[PDB]
């Protein structure tokens, strides 16, 4: 809505990305956002201040300011935030935890000791929300009203893809779209090295490799076609592309990306289990 | 311009992509485009017909129709097209070869036997022009007027990134952004397999992996930051993402993408050398 | 049927595995009588020569008698034997002959070069088929030579279509076809033996494991041939999230399973070009 | 000339396997499509959309499927089975044959659930695969404690109309799942790659796919109709010094055989984990 | 207390190496920035933008650099050198020392070009690296046919103000290029990865980078100031049974040493190819 007030506990990379995306989208006004942080000298904190986001060192102040309260701290800090500000949670509050692995149940258990029906949502988003091309899923807690999930989808749809999921899919989403941008950054660096190796200036190589990945992903999102079909479409017989595809297969390219999604998903499960 | 008439020799994947992108951009009207093909029953030919592109089985007819003439056939077919329609090339014609590896000099040599100052351009684009997110470079030939390169940049900028390069960079661009989308499609298929392996429905996994790659590439294009810095930004200490990055490094992920750009670039050079 | 009543005489120079497989498929198809086939071999002690005799095929040690008997003459000897064969019986090739080379790598040009020294317009077709013609499920391509009539190509297609898939190609595709469907059955036999080993490792009787593995590959291949779907889409449709199949696909990927099959198709194709160049 | 005039078939679950069996059974002529009913909690699936075109009755309510059906196929994920069995267990009748198609789920676990509601549930466990859609499936089945002799023969009759089918001891089914249950996906992966190889060497993609699939089909048929060892058939294609034996060498150098062994094992091992997780 | 009052330095090329040497020389106090001139065909480079902030004279015309300069550094790509030498060869004077910094390009090829215009060109070939920007470069040089004794001593004086510098025989320079020319990039890659390792084990990225870089700097210093073999110094850190020897084992298992040998060789081999291509 318009009257809506949003707060972040955590003023790191994710909070900045979300706030910058929300304000760019126009769904939120920077002055309706407050962030708190233990280190008020972070680079991300300075930038929020230029954007017009309110800033404080006191999580309690962010809570009293906020209607929607995003939890954007590390997983092992979540149990402490909840103990710190659990008494300050009111009926009007929707708590949106963005921490990897941390379960709705563990958040509801800590918060229920203060007030009995805390409205909790768990989400997994990623940094490209900063350019309003994020990928976000969310699961609704026990006491989240029906309007809570819809308000959440409205807000996070404005900065990229958003869809509701069962909570037991979120650990796998973390390995895929949560960690995904880092796989892409690693890939682009390497593709740029390849271009440079074959004679391209670095800056041209980075722009071309990025544009290639962006356009390809866009083609897949705008197509009903399987990605192998689109690969077929662009692999001319005997040509350059099919030769490059072979050397990727020879190194087990596909299995490395499977390994990655699996490794991130399994680590996310450990971050949960380490909580309880 | 508006009066401009464009033709394609070749009605395959690339011709459709370019025509669909040009018409979507609004820089060209479908009725100002003509394509010719030896197999008038191709799926890409049927689609051009629905778009309103004129179609013919006679390359000579496309040439007489066209002011800008795109050559969108396989590299070993180019020498035959030029022999077929070389007498039909007029002063007003700009010949834009999109074939991998085929040099401006080889095109100018064949065409100069008919008329002495053929205006030739070599380009390397990719299929994401279909969603107006292509990556394109071009080099100007000996007799291309100054307005020719600018008209070309105007047209191809409307369907994605475009920049002029020295011709000796084009073989490396082919390995990077020419073959790039196929690396991305392979990557997305594998990332989807990873998501499915960890419990996601296939359709959700494909959408999330694609959105992740798109958003990440967009972040890099909108940033002055090095891709390793953006990787740093999203690799939380001890977290899921840094664990996945390790297993990518353990398989030599980076070197496989370097291998690919190199293999495609080297194959492109063979496709040229095989001509001469 | 229409071909049966054409009452064609067929010859094989070379009485090996392919000659036997084609003879067995043509007769099973009812398009040729076994005794309307004649095959020659310098070695009449091969097992395939005995199998051919048993089914009623005529056998002779003299290639000239095969040629004189034949209307369609299949050259089914090793590539390096082809030029010696053409020297020997080039004088006996007649204007009525359609000469079909099945040898890997050997080009129409090289065959026509030899035979043009005798009659001026040898009718030559180059073929790449495979041994599952023996169960009428072969995979065949052919290219027509310089003097091959349009009816020659249609007849060859009608004949090879009776024992499986058959289609005309430009000759410059045949080396690649050899690497794919010419050698393909051997890739599948290796895969079926390995899958059976896997089933036995996990506790299945060998007989059952072999049966199930082969039935699994047959049905998947049949699904693909009857679907308009990409094989990756079919793979997606069978890969239940979190399930047994996606876990097995991972271990395939981790060994570069896909690259091995690409490697094999390339290695057979490359070898096929060497077999031409060495003779 | 088989046909089951007195049999009503139901599917709990309207996914890829349900569509494949329903399509195979109707193409085999053994069942009128309108004598099939399927249920699913997402009546917006592509498979549920195709089932309506066939004429299969579709409902959202699993209780409706059970009441309509004699033979009831459980074609849902292994972890959904215990919930299904709780939901409809009070609707299982003496006439019902329950045929579970879920990977890993034992006859014992299914009978334990249903016996709470009514003693002597007639349970069969089967492992089939999607090529039943072209009547070339590979199916095994094991009969439960209270399945009658006519129940197994009947299920063999029905599933034999869509491919190979034999009875097995239940403790072989996890291994069958790794071989023929997952097998078609190994083949689709192999055909994608073989086609990639054909394209590399210069073939059009469409021809490469056709030829690769034809090669595999014909080789599988040869083995099925031959009494000979697959190594013997491989020997018959491998001309001395030739192209095939050179390619076979590069498969061996990659450990191609061990990868397929690895696959059957991993799928089998995972199937056992799907039992114990539920 | 070194300073070259009578020396005018010019750079043909205004890229990373030109900026690094110009910055090192000015920080060393040996050259006023305004006594440096650099030329480049793209006066829109980030390096050319930084050079103007230093006070270095910048021109687009290579002829201007030559006329301003006594010591002329060729800091362009190897394939550009022959074009540069054709463009300005008629402007080379007796007073000029030409110092080529291009990988691979021999003294012989440079002298052949310039001798067409004027006999006895004074040519020095050097291989340096970008840490000259922090006065810790590693530089070798070889003197040409017509370089006087004072020319080499002078160039050693100048480049010693920004790091290690020694004269070598020219046929060692390709190998030096693979070791110290490319070396810093091996180190940047190693520091990125070591930091990735620190982050994996729970350190903030900024601390991990700092500590990794400090570790490397301190180890390099230890070796430089020790007479001892690097294996001996490694032995001194590897406490029996401890953390370091366990990590060293995993480096050995990956063939870590051979990768660095591979790198020096590949860079050296490529450097020789850059000579022969031009
Ligand atoms: O994979 C190839 O070899 C390839 C082929 C082309 N095209 C399009 C039309 N004619 C060509 O050569 C473009 C880019 C690549 Cl990278
Ligand atoms: O790499 C990680 O472990 C990771 C961490 C997060 N965030 C952001 C704020 N708190 C978190 O846990 C989100 C996604 C991932 Cl994939
Ligand atoms: O890949 C799996 O895990 C798998 C899953 C199934 N199905 C179908 C319906 N319920 C199941 O479990 C069957 C065979 C396999 Cl091999
Ligand atoms: O493995 C080979 O080299 C091979 C050999 C043949 N034949 C049959 C008769 N003469 C040949 O060359 C056919 C197919 C292949 Cl794939
Ligand atoms: O390699 C080790 O295990 C190690 C050991 C030590 N020291 C010094 C005295 N006692 C220790 O444990 C310090 C650092 C490391 Cl890295």
Curated annotation (Swiss-Prot), chains D, E:
GO molecular function, one term: identical protein binding
Catalysed conversion reaction: L-proline + NADP(+) = (S)-1-pyrroline-5-carboxylate + NADPH + 2 H(+); L-proline + NAD(+) = (S)-1-pyrroline-5-carboxylate + NADH + 2 H(+)
Binding site for L-proline: 170, 243-244
Entry keyword annotation includes Amino-acid biosynthesis: yes
Classification via Pfam families: F420_oxidored, P5CR_dimer
Consequence of changing residue 227 to A: Reduced enzyme activity
Pathway info: Amino-acid biosynthesis; L-proline biosynthesis; L-proline from L-glutamate 5-semialdehyde: step 1/1
TM region(s), chain numbering: none
Keywords per UniProt: Acetylation, Amino-acid biosynthesis, Disease variant, Mitochondrion, NADP, Oxidoreductase, Phosphoprotein, Proline biosynthesis, Stress response
Main localization (coarse): mitochondrion
Record PTM N-acetylserine, positions in chain: 8
Disease affiliated with this protein: Cutis laxa, autosomal recessive, 2B: A disorder characterized by an excessive congenital skin wrinkling, a large fontanelle with delayed closure, a typical facial appearance with downslanting palpebral fissures, a general connective tissue weakness, and varying degrees of growth and developmental delay and neurological abnormalities. Patients do not manifest metabolic abnormalities.
The protein, known as: Pyrroline-5-carboxylate reductase 1, mitochondrial
Gene name tied to this protein: PYCR1
